[PDB]
């Protein structure tokens, strides 16, 4: 009945200081397709749910959604090992899930309850997981950190690599350039990834960068530009970049051309610097979930009915997770001073006045 695997054509990557790039043809098994589809769908529904909870004021402060960029987190995960490392900025709900955290833990952290992955201490921007280092709020700060994690990989000789992600807006931060230099100087297994969604908050790439060829900003470091809406292209480029780094050749730059459907954050309607027609055009022409779906249905890797059933299962998983995140209690006030220092005996911490004391345990 169903094909067990199918070959597809993927866009050729633009190269910088590379003789040859990833292959322009790849094989997708039915088993992998089903996994990728379910994963992207979960990320998609989780973000639409976060949006709803935010409007209801269940979620506070910052809340950056990644819908439209699902091919990036799922495609990246598909190209690396669970033992590999990854770090990114604040738009990391998708990455937290692909790296192993349940939808429940994630939504519970967004709603600031005790059951959150951080127990309501960090919120939307600061989530950690196995070999996932955030989830960082200061633009560009995560790049030198990723180089540091890559240094540790080399130092311990484990043959693992580190994926360091940053946006187009962050590509103009000076520390990113100090990082390129050191990574190349010490040949660190660092994969520098620029997620280019065309806008730095409200500023388009052309108004913020003198040069919009992000994959070549590394100069002496080789790079490649990839189609960030095609899960298969991302997976292929990632497998290529990872193998490049594991062979000891040093760092490499990867530019993912993608797009975000929502504004910069929940407080930005995202229409003062771009039109509604543009957003819908990208959606109808290249929604990553739609593209994978059409591929699998056409190649008979899966039926339109099976994919529909998966959607139903995902929607229920999301709903049950949201129920848990809105019913779960807040962290008790008595643990406010907890985890200031690691491996230290208990001590007291001052509150709003000298008569208010909070216990602090590691």
């Amino acid at each position: 009945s169903f094909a067990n695997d199918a070959t597809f054509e993927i866009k050729k990557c633009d190269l910088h200081r590379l003789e040859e790039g990833p292959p322009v043809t790849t094989v997708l098994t039915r088993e992998d397709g089903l996994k990728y589809y379910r994963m992207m769908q979960t990320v998609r529904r989780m973000e639409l749910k976060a949006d709803q909870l935010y409007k209801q004021k269940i979620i506070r402060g910052f809340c950056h959604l990644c819908d439209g960029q699902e091919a990036c987190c799922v495609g990246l995960e598909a190209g690396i090992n669970p033992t590999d490392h990854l770090i990114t900025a604040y738009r990391a709900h998708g990455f937290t899930f692909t790296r192993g955290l349940s939808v429940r833990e994630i939504l519970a952290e967004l709603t600031g309850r005790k059951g959150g992955c951080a127990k309501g201490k960090g919120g939307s921007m600061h989530m950690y997981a196995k070999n996932f280092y955030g989830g960082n709020g200061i633009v560009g700060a995560q790049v030198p950190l990723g180089a540091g994690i890559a240094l540790a990989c080399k130092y311990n000789g484990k043959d693992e690599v580190c994926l360091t992600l940053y946006g187009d807006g962050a590509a103009n931060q000076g520390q990113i350039f100090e990082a390129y230099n050191m990574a190349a100087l010490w040949k660190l297994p660092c994969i520098f990834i620029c997620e280019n969604n065309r806008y730095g908050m409200g500023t388009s790439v052309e108004r913020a960068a003198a040069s919009t060829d992000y994959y070549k900003r590394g100069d002496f470091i080789p790079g490649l530009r990839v189609d960030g809406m095609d899960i298969l292209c991302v997976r292929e480029a990632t497998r290529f970049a990872a193998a490049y780094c594991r062979s000891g050749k040093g760092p490499i730059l990867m530019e993912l051309q993608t797009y975000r459907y929502h504004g910069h954050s929940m407080s930005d309607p995202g229409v003062s610097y771009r039109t509604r027609e543009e957003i819908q055009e990208v959606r109808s022409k290249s929604d990553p979930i739609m593209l994978l779906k059409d591929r699998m249905v056409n190649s008979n890797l899966a039926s339109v009915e099976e994919l529909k059933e998966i959607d139903v299962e995902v929607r229920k998983e999301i709903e049950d997770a949201a129920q848990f995140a809105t019913a779960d209690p807040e962290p008790p006030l008595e643990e406010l001073g907890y985890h200031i220092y690691s491996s230290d005996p208990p001590f007291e911490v001052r509150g709003a006045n000298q008569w208010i004391k909070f216990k602090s345990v590691s």
Partner: protein
Amino acid sequence: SLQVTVRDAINQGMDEELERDEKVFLLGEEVAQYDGAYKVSRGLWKKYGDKRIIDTPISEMGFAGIAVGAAMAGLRPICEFMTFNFSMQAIDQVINSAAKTYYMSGGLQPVPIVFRGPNGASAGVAAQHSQCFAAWYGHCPGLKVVSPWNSEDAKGLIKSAIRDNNPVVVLENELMYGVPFEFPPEAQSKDFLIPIGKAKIERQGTHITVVSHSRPVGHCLEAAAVLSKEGVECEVINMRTIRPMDMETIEASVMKTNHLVTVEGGWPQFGVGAEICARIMEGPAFNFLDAPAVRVTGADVPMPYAKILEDNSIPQVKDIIFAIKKTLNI
């Protein structure tokens, strides 16, 4: 005479100084076409164009240094940090390039620049976006630091900041931006100026002196209203300037009330409250004290996300009242 928000008072101040001097210009992230990250610079670009209102890439250290360089060359830049948490990347330019230059050059190179933007706690923004830098900046010589509370403070201080020929750090507050205040005709004038280095008594009192700056000033006033019904009269002082602070007004008040309480939103250790208490103990007001001065501040932990945790990490009216009753022993 009319209602105007802090956001609109600051916008008014910049607008008037831009019209008054062609050497003045604004630069920062999303300050132009986006109308400002918090809409404070709204309408400015549309009125003055790309030459005066300049959107910049996300390069703090970079555009801060550029602003300082433009100031050394005779221009009078207004450098906006989306939040001062981000000023840490550019703090070297503020301290080592802007602040010490006039002194190092023996009085040959002045630096007329203004660094402004929201400072301190907001709402649910977590640890990396809730830090107050009043104490850090107020610690450096050659720098002037102001922290306005209401609309009148905001407009008067930003205009004075722009006219001063030395670097001035204006620590604003995001939570105060949308708060409306009664704007008298004197504040509506384009000649309205509030001198740097002078405190203000927002409420006369005889029982105790309560000193604060920025948003918490509002909490002190509410605290004063509640205690008032109990027969306690607080003298609420709005610092306005962090450096050089007006200790004379504070000491004069202490000589009358014999009790002192400081309220700030930042971390307690080496904070603004500590400096006030030390100044009090070194000055002539120490002997007028009938009880030790007490400090109300934010909790000594990085800002937690959870609502109930965040509320207990920032001083509340009840914390202020509790500290006052302790000092007066009632």
